[PDB]
Design a protein around this ligand. Sequence first.
Ligand SMILES: O=C(O)CSc1nnc(Br)n1-c1ccc(C2CC2)c2ccccc12
Length: 517
Amino acid sequence: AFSELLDQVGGLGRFQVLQTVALVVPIMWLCTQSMLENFSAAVPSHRCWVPLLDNSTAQASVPGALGPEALLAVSIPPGPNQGPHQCRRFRQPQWQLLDPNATATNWSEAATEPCVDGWVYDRSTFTSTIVAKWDLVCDSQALKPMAQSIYLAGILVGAAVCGPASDRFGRRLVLTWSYLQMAVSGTAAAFAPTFPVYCLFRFLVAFAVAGVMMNTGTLVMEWTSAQARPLVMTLNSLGFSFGHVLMAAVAYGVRDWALLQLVVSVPFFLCFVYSCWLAESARWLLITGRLDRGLRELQRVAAINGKRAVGDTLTPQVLLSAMQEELSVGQAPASLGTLLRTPGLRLRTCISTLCWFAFGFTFFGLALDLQALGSNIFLLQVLIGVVDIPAKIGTLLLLSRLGRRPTQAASLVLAGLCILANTLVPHEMGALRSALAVLGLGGLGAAFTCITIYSGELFPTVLRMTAVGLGQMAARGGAILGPLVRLLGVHGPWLPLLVYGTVPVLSGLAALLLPET
Ligand SMILES: O=C(O)CSc1nnc(Br)n1-c1ccc(C2CC2)c2ccccc12
Protein backbone atom coordinates (compact mmCIF):
# COMPACT_ATOMS: atom_id res chain seq x y z
CA ALA A 1 0.00 0.00 0.00
CA PHE A 2 0.97 3.66 0.21
CA SER A 3 3.75 4.71 2.56
CA GLU A 4 1.38 6.60 4.86
CA LEU A 5 -1.05 3.68 5.05
CA LEU A 6 1.69 1.08 5.55
CA ASP A 7 3.11 3.32 8.29
CA GLN A 8 -0.18 3.81 10.13
CA VAL A 9 -0.57 0.03 9.88
CA GLY A 10 3.06 -0.83 10.71
CA GLY A 11 6.11 -1.22 8.50
CA LEU A 12 7.91 -4.17 10.12
CA GLY A 13 6.04 -6.08 12.81
CA ARG A 14 4.51 -9.43 13.78
CA PHE A 15 2.62 -9.91 10.52
CA GLN A 16 5.74 -9.29 8.41
CA VAL A 17 7.75 -11.92 10.45
CA LEU A 18 4.86 -14.47 10.17
CA GLN A 19 4.27 -14.07 6.44
CA THR A 20 8.00 -14.10 5.64
CA VAL A 21 8.46 -17.36 7.56
CA ALA A 22 5.34 -18.88 5.96
CA LEU A 23 6.63 -17.92 2.49
CA VAL A 24 10.27 -18.92 3.07
CA VAL A 25 9.54 -22.40 4.44
CA PRO A 26 8.25 -23.53 1.00
CA ILE A 27 11.44 -22.20 -0.62
CA MET A 28 13.47 -25.01 0.97
CA TRP A 29 11.05 -27.65 -0.34
CA LEU A 30 11.17 -25.97 -3.75
CA CYS A 31 14.96 -26.04 -3.90
CA THR A 32 14.58 -29.72 -3.08
CA GLN A 33 12.30 -30.06 -6.10
CA SER A 34 14.80 -28.21 -8.30
CA MET A 35 17.81 -30.26 -7.16
CA LEU A 36 16.04 -33.64 -7.04
CA GLU A 37 17.59 -34.47 -10.43
CA ASN A 38 21.00 -35.19 -8.90
CA PHE A 39 19.63 -38.14 -6.91
CA SER A 40 16.54 -39.32 -8.81
CA ALA A 41 18.42 -39.30 -12.14
CA ALA A 42 21.79 -40.71 -11.09
CA VAL A 43 23.69 -42.83 -13.61
CA PRO A 44 25.01 -46.04 -11.99
CA SER A 45 27.42 -48.50 -13.53
CA HIS A 46 25.58 -50.45 -16.24
CA ARG A 47 27.18 -53.54 -17.72
CA CYS A 48 25.46 -55.48 -20.50
CA TRP A 49 23.15 -58.38 -19.70
CA VAL A 50 24.76 -61.75 -20.41
CA PRO A 51 23.15 -65.22 -20.16
CA LEU A 52 26.29 -66.73 -18.61
CA LEU A 53 26.05 -64.89 -15.27
CA ASP A 54 22.44 -63.76 -14.82
CA ASN A 55 21.07 -67.15 -15.89
CA SER A 56 22.12 -69.56 -13.14
CA THR A 57 21.41 -72.67 -15.24
CA ALA A 58 24.25 -72.01 -17.69
CA GLN A 59 26.68 -71.12 -14.90
CA ALA A 60 25.84 -74.27 -12.93
CA SER A 61 26.10 -76.40 -16.08
CA VAL A 62 29.87 -75.91 -16.23
CA PRO A 63 31.55 -78.35 -13.80
CA GLY A 64 33.05 -76.73 -10.73
CA ALA A 65 32.89 -73.02 -9.98
CA LEU A 66 34.34 -70.05 -11.88
CA GLY A 67 34.86 -66.70 -10.19
CA PRO A 68 32.71 -63.83 -11.47
CA GLU A 69 35.75 -61.66 -12.20
CA ALA A 70 37.25 -64.27 -14.53
CA LEU A 71 33.89 -65.20 -16.08
CA LEU A 72 33.05 -61.56 -16.88
CA ALA A 73 36.04 -61.13 -19.21
CA VAL A 74 34.97 -64.06 -21.42
CA SER A 75 31.67 -62.25 -22.05
CA ILE A 76 32.48 -58.50 -21.92
CA PRO A 77 34.87 -56.61 -24.24
CA PRO A 78 37.56 -54.65 -22.38
CA GLY A 79 36.25 -51.11 -22.68
CA PRO A 80 38.18 -47.85 -22.62
CA ASN A 81 40.00 -46.79 -19.45
CA GLN A 82 40.69 -50.39 -18.37
CA GLY A 83 37.07 -51.31 -17.75
CA PRO A 84 34.14 -53.31 -19.11
CA HIS A 85 32.30 -52.01 -22.15
CA GLN A 86 28.99 -50.58 -20.94
CA CYS A 87 27.11 -50.92 -24.25
CA ARG A 88 28.75 -53.98 -25.85
CA ARG A 89 29.10 -57.70 -25.14
CA PHE A 90 30.61 -60.80 -26.69
CA ARG A 91 28.22 -62.49 -29.11
CA GLN A 92 29.75 -65.86 -28.21
CA PRO A 93 31.94 -66.86 -25.25
CA GLN A 94 35.71 -66.88 -25.79
CA TRP A 95 37.66 -69.12 -23.41
CA GLN A 96 40.94 -68.00 -25.00
CA LEU A 97 40.85 -64.73 -23.04
CA LEU A 98 40.33 -66.79 -19.87
CA ASP A 99 44.04 -67.62 -19.62
CA PRO A 100 45.87 -64.62 -18.10
CA ASN A 101 49.03 -65.46 -20.07
CA ALA A 102 47.50 -64.46 -23.41
CA THR A 103 47.39 -60.73 -24.08
CA ALA A 104 43.94 -59.14 -23.99
CA THR A 105 44.75 -56.81 -26.90
CA ASN A 106 43.53 -59.37 -29.43
CA TRP A 107 40.22 -59.51 -27.53
CA SER A 108 38.42 -56.32 -28.56
CA GLU A 109 35.00 -55.06 -29.65
CA ALA A 110 35.66 -55.75 -33.34
CA ALA A 111 33.17 -58.65 -33.27
CA THR A 112 31.12 -57.58 -30.24
CA GLU A 113 27.34 -57.82 -29.89
CA PRO A 114 25.39 -54.62 -29.14
CA CYS A 115 23.24 -54.87 -26.03
CA VAL A 116 20.09 -56.78 -27.00
CA ASP A 117 18.88 -58.28 -23.71
CA GLY A 118 19.13 -55.04 -21.73
CA TRP A 119 21.43 -53.62 -19.09
CA VAL A 120 22.26 -54.78 -15.56
CA TYR A 121 22.54 -51.80 -13.24
CA ASP A 122 24.09 -51.74 -9.78
CA ARG A 123 21.96 -51.11 -6.69
CA SER A 124 24.67 -50.67 -4.05
CA THR A 125 24.01 -46.93 -3.66
CA PHE A 126 20.67 -46.32 -5.44
CA THR A 127 17.92 -48.92 -5.07
CA SER A 128 16.19 -47.57 -8.18
CA THR A 129 16.67 -44.66 -10.56
CA ILE A 130 15.08 -43.08 -13.61
CA VAL A 131 18.06 -44.08 -15.76
CA ALA A 132 17.91 -47.67 -14.51
CA LYS A 133 14.13 -47.75 -15.03
CA TRP A 134 13.90 -46.41 -18.60
CA ASP A 135 17.37 -47.50 -19.81
CA LEU A 136 18.59 -43.95 -20.44
CA VAL A 137 22.09 -45.20 -21.28
CA CYS A 138 24.22 -45.61 -24.42
CA ASP A 139 22.08 -44.54 -27.41
CA SER A 140 19.52 -42.92 -25.09
CA GLN A 141 22.21 -41.24 -22.96
CA ALA A 142 21.36 -37.86 -24.50
CA LEU A 143 17.82 -38.19 -23.13
CA LYS A 144 19.15 -37.55 -19.61
CA PRO A 145 20.19 -33.87 -20.05
CA MET A 146 17.12 -33.28 -22.23
CA ALA A 147 14.79 -34.14 -19.35
CA GLN A 148 16.74 -31.60 -17.30
CA SER A 149 16.41 -28.97 -20.03
CA ILE A 150 12.66 -29.42 -20.54
CA TYR A 151 12.10 -28.94 -16.81
CA LEU A 152 14.08 -25.70 -16.96
CA ALA A 153 12.16 -24.72 -20.09
CA GLY A 154 9.00 -24.95 -18.01
CA ILE A 155 10.34 -22.31 -15.63
CA LEU A 156 10.88 -19.96 -18.57
CA VAL A 157 7.29 -20.57 -19.63
CA GLY A 158 5.97 -20.09 -16.10
CA ALA A 159 7.48 -16.64 -15.70
CA ALA A 160 6.02 -15.84 -19.13
CA VAL A 161 2.51 -16.74 -17.92
CA CYS A 162 2.63 -16.03 -14.16
CA GLY A 163 3.53 -12.38 -14.77
CA PRO A 164 0.37 -11.07 -16.42
CA ALA A 165 -1.97 -13.60 -14.81
CA SER A 166 -0.88 -12.66 -11.30
CA ASP A 167 -1.34 -9.02 -12.35
CA ARG A 168 -4.99 -9.73 -13.22
CA PHE A 169 -6.09 -12.29 -10.61
CA GLY A 170 -3.83 -11.46 -7.65
CA ARG A 171 -0.80 -12.75 -5.80
CA ARG A 172 -2.40 -14.93 -3.11
CA LEU A 173 -4.69 -16.66 -5.62
CA VAL A 174 -1.89 -17.49 -8.05
CA LEU A 175 0.36 -18.53 -5.16
CA THR A 176 -2.25 -21.00 -3.88
CA TRP A 177 -2.92 -22.30 -7.39
CA SER A 178 0.81 -22.80 -7.99
CA TYR A 179 1.22 -24.60 -4.66
CA LEU A 180 -1.55 -27.05 -5.55
CA GLN A 181 -0.28 -27.46 -9.11
CA MET A 182 3.20 -28.26 -7.81
CA ALA A 183 1.84 -30.76 -5.29
CA VAL A 184 -0.34 -32.59 -7.81
CA SER A 185 2.26 -32.58 -10.60
CA GLY A 186 5.00 -33.87 -8.31
CA THR A 187 2.75 -36.57 -6.88
CA ALA A 188 1.72 -37.66 -10.39
CA ALA A 189 5.29 -37.67 -11.73
CA ALA A 190 6.19 -40.43 -9.26
CA PHE A 191 3.72 -42.79 -10.99
CA ALA A 192 4.68 -41.98 -14.59
CA PRO A 193 4.87 -45.27 -16.55
CA THR A 194 6.63 -43.78 -19.59
CA PHE A 195 9.41 -41.25 -20.09
CA PRO A 196 7.33 -38.65 -22.01
CA VAL A 197 4.68 -38.64 -19.28
CA TYR A 198 7.34 -38.03 -16.63
CA CYS A 199 8.84 -35.25 -18.75
CA LEU A 200 5.45 -33.57 -19.16
CA PHE A 201 4.76 -33.73 -15.42
CA ARG A 202 8.25 -32.36 -14.72
CA PHE A 203 7.53 -29.46 -17.09
CA LEU A 204 4.30 -28.74 -15.21
CA VAL A 205 6.23 -28.88 -11.92
CA ALA A 206 8.66 -26.32 -13.33
CA PHE A 207 5.72 -24.12 -14.33
CA ALA A 208 4.47 -24.28 -10.75
CA VAL A 209 7.97 -23.55 -9.43
CA ALA A 210 8.24 -20.39 -11.51
CA GLY A 211 4.78 -19.30 -10.39
CA VAL A 212 5.55 -19.86 -6.71
CA MET A 213 8.89 -18.07 -6.94
CA MET A 214 7.50 -14.99 -8.68
CA ASN A 215 4.40 -14.73 -6.49
CA THR A 216 6.20 -15.18 -3.17
CA GLY A 217 8.86 -12.68 -4.21
CA THR A 218 6.25 -10.11 -5.21
CA LEU A 219 4.22 -10.56 -2.02
CA VAL A 220 7.31 -10.25 0.18
CA MET A 221 8.48 -7.16 -1.71
CA GLU A 222 5.08 -5.46 -1.54
CA TRP A 223 4.33 -6.14 2.13
CA THR A 224 7.80 -5.05 3.32
CA SER A 225 9.11 -1.53 3.82
CA ALA A 226 10.93 0.34 1.07
CA GLN A 227 14.30 0.41 2.85
CA ALA A 228 14.43 -3.41 3.15
CA ARG A 229 13.17 -4.75 -0.19
CA PRO A 230 16.47 -6.23 -1.51
CA LEU A 231 17.26 -7.53 1.98
CA VAL A 232 14.19 -9.76 2.14
CA MET A 233 14.66 -10.70 -1.52
CA THR A 234 18.11 -11.99 -0.56
CA LEU A 235 16.41 -13.78 2.33
CA ASN A 236 14.19 -15.44 -0.28
CA SER A 237 17.41 -16.61 -1.95
CA LEU A 238 18.89 -17.78 1.38
CA GLY A 239 15.82 -19.97 1.76
CA PHE A 240 16.91 -21.78 -1.41
CA SER A 241 20.43 -21.92 0.01
CA PHE A 242 19.16 -23.85 3.05
CA GLY A 243 16.91 -25.91 0.80
CA HIS A 244 20.16 -27.28 -0.58
CA VAL A 245 20.99 -28.73 2.85
CA LEU A 246 17.43 -30.01 3.20
CA MET A 247 17.75 -31.84 -0.13
CA ALA A 248 21.08 -33.31 0.96
CA ALA A 249 19.49 -34.58 4.18
CA VAL A 250 16.39 -36.05 2.51
CA ALA A 251 18.27 -37.97 -0.19
CA TYR A 252 20.43 -39.86 2.32
CA GLY A 253 17.24 -41.23 3.90
CA VAL A 254 15.24 -42.50 0.92
CA ARG A 255 17.12 -44.20 -1.94
CA ASP A 256 14.56 -44.27 -4.76
CA TRP A 257 13.26 -42.21 -7.66
CA ALA A 258 9.52 -42.52 -6.93
CA LEU A 259 9.46 -42.42 -3.12
CA LEU A 260 11.88 -39.48 -3.14
CA GLN A 261 9.71 -37.52 -5.58
CA LEU A 262 6.51 -38.32 -3.67
CA VAL A 263 7.95 -37.31 -0.30
CA VAL A 264 9.45 -34.15 -1.80
CA SER A 265 6.18 -33.10 -3.44
CA VAL A 266 3.62 -34.14 -0.79
CA PRO A 267 4.23 -31.21 1.64
CA PHE A 268 2.94 -28.77 -0.98
CA PHE A 269 -0.55 -30.08 -0.23
CA LEU A 270 -0.22 -28.73 3.31
CA CYS A 271 1.28 -25.61 1.73
CA PHE A 272 -1.90 -25.14 -0.31
CA VAL A 273 -4.05 -25.75 2.77
CA TYR A 274 -2.41 -23.08 4.90
CA SER A 275 -1.94 -20.76 1.90
CA CYS A 276 -5.64 -19.86 2.15
CA TRP A 277 -4.90 -17.76 5.27
CA LEU A 278 -2.11 -15.58 3.85
CA ALA A 279 -2.84 -11.94 3.04
CA GLU A 280 -3.29 -10.65 -0.49
CA SER A 281 -1.11 -7.64 -1.21
CA ALA A 282 -3.00 -4.43 -0.45
CA ARG A 283 -1.03 -2.41 -3.02
CA TRP A 284 -2.36 -4.46 -5.94
CA LEU A 285 -5.88 -4.39 -4.50
CA LEU A 286 -5.80 -0.59 -4.23
CA ILE A 287 -4.26 0.18 -7.62
CA THR A 288 -6.64 -2.30 -9.36
CA GLY A 289 -9.79 -0.70 -7.88
CA ARG A 290 -10.44 -3.35 -5.20
CA LEU A 291 -11.19 -0.99 -2.30
CA ASP A 292 -13.34 -2.94 0.18
CA ARG A 293 -11.01 -5.95 0.13
CA GLY A 294 -7.97 -3.69 0.46
CA LEU A 295 -9.52 -1.94 3.46
CA ARG A 296 -10.35 -5.28 5.09
CA GLU A 297 -6.83 -6.57 4.43
CA LEU A 298 -5.23 -3.43 5.88
CA GLN A 299 -7.43 -3.63 8.98
CA ARG A 300 -6.54 -7.31 9.41
CA VAL A 301 -2.81 -6.61 9.16
CA ALA A 302 -3.07 -3.69 11.59
CA ALA A 303 -5.00 -5.78 14.12
CA ILE A 304 -2.45 -8.59 13.76
CA ASN A 305 0.30 -6.01 14.33
CA GLY A 306 -1.42 -4.94 17.56
CA LYS A 307 -3.04 -1.68 16.38
CA ARG A 308 -6.85 -1.87 16.45
CA ALA A 309 -7.76 1.80 17.00
CA VAL A 310 -5.68 2.88 13.99
CA GLY A 311 -7.44 0.37 11.76
CA ASP A 312 -10.88 1.26 13.11
CA THR A 313 -10.38 4.90 12.07
CA LEU A 314 -9.51 4.07 8.45
CA THR A 315 -12.07 5.13 5.84
CA PRO A 316 -12.32 4.69 2.05
CA GLN A 317 -11.87 8.44 1.50
CA VAL A 318 -8.46 8.56 3.19
CA LEU A 319 -7.62 5.25 1.51
CA LEU A 320 -8.21 6.74 -1.94
CA SER A 321 -6.50 10.03 -1.04
CA ALA A 322 -3.34 8.20 0.05
CA MET A 323 -3.21 6.28 -3.24
CA GLN A 324 -3.97 9.37 -5.35
CA GLU A 325 -0.23 9.80 -5.91
CA GLU A 326 -0.23 6.49 -7.81
CA LEU A 327 -3.70 6.86 -9.35
CA SER A 328 -3.06 10.26 -10.95
CA VAL A 329 0.33 9.12 -12.28
CA GLY A 330 -0.75 5.90 -13.96
CA GLN A 331 2.74 4.51 -14.55
CA ALA A 332 2.56 2.16 -17.53
CA PRO A 333 5.48 -0.23 -18.19
CA ALA A 334 7.91 1.19 -20.73
CA SER A 335 8.70 -0.90 -23.79
CA LEU A 336 12.24 -1.75 -24.86
CA GLY A 337 11.84 0.71 -27.74
CA THR A 338 12.76 3.47 -25.29
CA LEU A 339 15.59 1.43 -23.70
CA LEU A 340 17.83 0.05 -26.46
CA ARG A 341 17.38 3.09 -28.71
CA THR A 342 19.55 5.38 -26.57
CA PRO A 343 23.19 4.82 -27.62
CA GLY A 344 24.46 5.74 -24.15
CA LEU A 345 22.54 2.91 -22.47
CA ARG A 346 23.33 -0.02 -24.81
CA LEU A 347 26.57 -1.20 -23.20
CA ARG A 348 25.09 -1.25 -19.70
CA THR A 349 22.12 -3.43 -20.66
CA CYS A 350 24.31 -5.69 -22.81
CA ILE A 351 26.77 -6.34 -19.98
CA SER A 352 23.96 -6.81 -17.46
CA THR A 353 22.20 -9.44 -19.57
CA LEU A 354 25.59 -11.04 -20.24
CA CYS A 355 26.17 -11.46 -16.50
CA TRP A 356 22.64 -12.72 -15.85
CA PHE A 357 22.83 -15.26 -18.68
CA ALA A 358 26.32 -16.38 -17.69
CA PHE A 359 25.22 -17.16 -14.15
CA GLY A 360 21.94 -18.80 -15.15
CA PHE A 361 23.80 -20.96 -17.66
CA THR A 362 26.95 -22.02 -15.81
CA PHE A 363 25.37 -22.55 -12.39
CA PHE A 364 22.53 -24.75 -13.66
CA GLY A 365 24.76 -26.61 -16.10
CA LEU A 366 27.16 -27.44 -13.28
CA ALA A 367 24.84 -28.15 -10.34
CA LEU A 368 22.60 -30.55 -12.27
CA ASP A 369 25.53 -32.89 -13.02
CA LEU A 370 26.88 -32.86 -9.48
CA GLN A 371 28.35 -36.35 -9.92
CA ALA A 372 30.97 -35.10 -12.40
CA LEU A 373 32.23 -32.41 -10.01
CA GLY A 374 33.36 -34.69 -7.18
CA SER A 375 33.40 -38.19 -5.69
CA ASN A 376 30.09 -38.52 -3.82
CA ILE A 377 26.98 -36.41 -4.25
CA PHE A 378 25.72 -36.20 -0.65
CA LEU A 379 28.86 -34.52 0.67
CA LEU A 380 28.92 -32.14 -2.30
CA GLN A 381 25.31 -31.11 -1.70
CA VAL A 382 25.86 -30.64 2.04
CA LEU A 383 29.00 -28.56 1.50
CA ILE A 384 27.33 -26.44 -1.19
CA GLY A 385 24.44 -25.69 1.15
CA VAL A 386 26.78 -24.93 4.04
CA VAL A 387 29.13 -22.66 2.09
CA ASP A 388 26.65 -20.71 -0.05
CA ILE A 389 25.31 -19.01 3.11
CA PRO A 390 28.55 -17.40 4.37
CA ALA A 391 29.50 -16.31 0.84
CA LYS A 392 26.15 -14.59 0.33
CA ILE A 393 26.32 -12.94 3.76
CA GLY A 394 29.86 -11.70 3.16
CA THR A 395 29.00 -10.34 -0.28
CA LEU A 396 26.76 -7.75 1.38
CA LEU A 397 29.62 -6.61 3.61
CA LEU A 398 31.98 -6.45 0.63
CA LEU A 399 29.44 -4.30 -1.22
CA SER A 400 29.08 -2.07 1.84
CA ARG A 401 32.84 -1.50 2.19
CA LEU A 402 33.81 -2.01 -1.47
CA GLY A 403 32.50 -1.03 -4.88
CA ARG A 404 29.86 -3.05 -6.67
CA ARG A 405 31.81 -3.42 -9.93
CA PRO A 406 35.07 -4.79 -8.42
CA THR A 407 33.12 -7.22 -6.23
CA GLN A 408 31.12 -8.45 -9.22
CA ALA A 409 34.21 -8.88 -11.38
CA ALA A 410 36.23 -10.61 -8.67
CA SER A 411 33.45 -13.00 -7.67
CA LEU A 412 32.56 -14.03 -11.23
CA VAL A 413 36.20 -14.42 -12.30
CA LEU A 414 37.13 -16.43 -9.19
CA ALA A 415 34.13 -18.74 -9.60
CA GLY A 416 34.97 -19.34 -13.26
CA LEU A 417 38.65 -19.92 -12.52
CA CYS A 418 37.84 -22.37 -9.71
CA ILE A 419 35.52 -24.30 -12.03
CA LEU A 420 38.25 -24.37 -14.69
CA ALA A 421 40.86 -25.57 -12.20
CA ASN A 422 38.55 -28.33 -10.96
CA THR A 423 39.01 -30.01 -14.35
CA LEU A 424 42.79 -29.66 -14.55
CA VAL A 425 43.49 -31.41 -11.22
CA PRO A 426 44.26 -35.15 -11.48
CA HIS A 427 41.15 -37.28 -11.16
CA GLU A 428 42.68 -39.59 -8.53
CA MET A 429 42.78 -36.83 -5.89
CA GLY A 430 39.12 -36.28 -5.07
CA ALA A 431 39.50 -34.07 -2.00
CA LEU A 432 40.66 -30.88 -3.72
CA ARG A 433 38.43 -31.80 -6.66
CA SER A 434 35.30 -31.53 -4.52
CA ALA A 435 36.72 -28.56 -2.60
CA LEU A 436 37.31 -26.62 -5.83
CA ALA A 437 33.85 -27.55 -7.12
CA VAL A 438 32.27 -26.32 -3.87
CA LEU A 439 34.26 -23.07 -3.93
CA GLY A 440 33.25 -22.46 -7.54
CA LEU A 441 29.57 -23.02 -6.78
CA GLY A 442 29.75 -20.71 -3.77
CA GLY A 443 31.44 -18.05 -5.87
CA LEU A 444 28.70 -18.39 -8.47
CA GLY A 445 26.06 -17.87 -5.79
CA ALA A 446 27.92 -14.83 -4.49
CA ALA A 447 28.13 -13.41 -8.01
CA PHE A 448 24.40 -13.99 -8.52
CA THR A 449 23.52 -12.12 -5.33
CA CYS A 450 25.91 -9.30 -6.25
CA ILE A 451 24.45 -8.90 -9.75
CA THR A 452 20.93 -8.96 -8.31
CA ILE A 453 21.89 -6.11 -5.98
CA TYR A 454 23.70 -4.31 -8.82
CA SER A 455 21.27 -4.53 -11.75
CA GLY A 456 18.64 -2.18 -10.33
CA GLU A 457 21.11 0.57 -9.48
CA LEU A 458 22.57 1.24 -12.94
CA PHE A 459 19.37 2.06 -14.82
CA PRO A 460 17.03 4.98 -14.03
CA THR A 461 13.99 4.48 -11.83
CA VAL A 462 11.52 4.35 -14.72
CA LEU A 463 13.44 1.77 -16.78
CA ARG A 464 14.72 -0.38 -13.89
CA MET A 465 11.94 -2.97 -14.06
CA THR A 466 12.33 -3.58 -17.80
CA ALA A 467 16.06 -4.20 -17.43
CA VAL A 468 15.51 -6.45 -14.41
CA GLY A 469 12.96 -8.53 -16.29
CA LEU A 470 15.24 -8.75 -19.32
CA GLY A 471 18.03 -10.00 -17.06
CA GLN A 472 15.77 -12.61 -15.47
CA MET A 473 14.64 -13.83 -18.90
CA ALA A 474 18.27 -14.05 -20.00
CA ALA A 475 19.13 -16.05 -16.88
CA ARG A 476 16.27 -18.47 -17.55
CA GLY A 477 17.36 -18.89 -21.17
CA GLY A 478 20.90 -19.60 -20.01
CA ALA A 479 19.57 -22.14 -17.53
CA ILE A 480 17.68 -23.86 -20.36
CA LEU A 481 20.83 -23.91 -22.51
CA GLY A 482 23.10 -25.06 -19.68
CA PRO A 483 22.28 -28.77 -19.63
CA LEU A 484 22.74 -28.94 -23.41
CA VAL A 485 26.48 -28.38 -22.95
CA ARG A 486 26.76 -31.87 -21.46
CA LEU A 487 25.67 -33.18 -24.86
CA LEU A 488 29.28 -32.38 -25.81
CA GLY A 489 30.55 -35.11 -23.51
CA VAL A 490 31.15 -37.85 -26.08
CA HIS A 491 34.48 -36.23 -26.93
CA GLY A 492 35.32 -36.20 -23.23
CA PRO A 493 34.04 -35.17 -19.80
CA TRP A 494 36.51 -32.27 -19.72
CA LEU A 495 34.92 -30.20 -22.50
CA PRO A 496 31.63 -29.35 -20.71
CA LEU A 497 33.55 -28.26 -17.62
CA LEU A 498 35.95 -26.21 -19.75
CA VAL A 499 32.99 -24.41 -21.32
CA TYR A 500 31.31 -23.90 -17.95
CA GLY A 501 34.51 -22.42 -16.54
CA THR A 502 35.45 -20.30 -19.54
CA VAL A 503 32.06 -18.59 -19.82
CA PRO A 504 32.08 -17.06 -16.29
CA VAL A 505 35.66 -15.82 -16.67
CA LEU A 506 34.84 -13.94 -19.87
CA SER A 507 31.60 -12.62 -18.38
CA GLY A 508 33.45 -11.31 -15.33
CA LEU A 509 36.18 -9.69 -17.40
CA ALA A 510 33.47 -8.01 -19.48
CA ALA A 511 31.68 -6.88 -16.30
CA LEU A 512 34.58 -4.51 -15.46
CA LEU A 513 33.57 -1.97 -18.13
CA LEU A 514 30.15 -0.86 -16.88
CA PRO A 515 30.22 2.13 -14.50
CA GLU A 516 30.41 1.78 -10.74
CA THR A 517 27.39 2.12 -8.46
O1 LIG B 1 14.08 -14.39 -7.55
C1 LIG B 1 14.18 -15.01 -6.46
O2 LIG B 1 13.22 -15.02 -5.65
C2 LIG B 1 15.48 -15.76 -6.12
S1 LIG B 1 15.48 -17.40 -6.93
C3 LIG B 1 17.05 -18.26 -6.56
N1 LIG B 1 17.62 -18.36 -5.38
N2 LIG B 1 18.77 -19.08 -5.54
C4 LIG B 1 18.86 -19.40 -6.82
BR1 LIG B 1 20.29 -20.43 -7.65
N3 LIG B 1 17.81 -18.90 -7.44
C5 LIG B 1 17.55 -19.01 -8.75
C6 LIG B 1 18.10 -18.09 -9.63
C7 LIG B 1 17.84 -18.20 -10.99
C8 LIG B 1 17.03 -19.22 -11.48
C9 LIG B 1 16.80 -19.26 -13.01
C10 LIG B 1 16.78 -20.49 -13.92
C11 LIG B 1 17.72 -19.33 -14.23
C12 LIG B 1 16.47 -20.16 -10.58
C13 LIG B 1 15.64 -21.21 -11.04
C14 LIG B 1 15.09 -22.13 -10.14
C15 LIG B 1 15.36 -22.01 -8.78
C16 LIG B 1 16.18 -20.98 -8.32
C17 LIG B 1 16.73 -20.05 -9.23
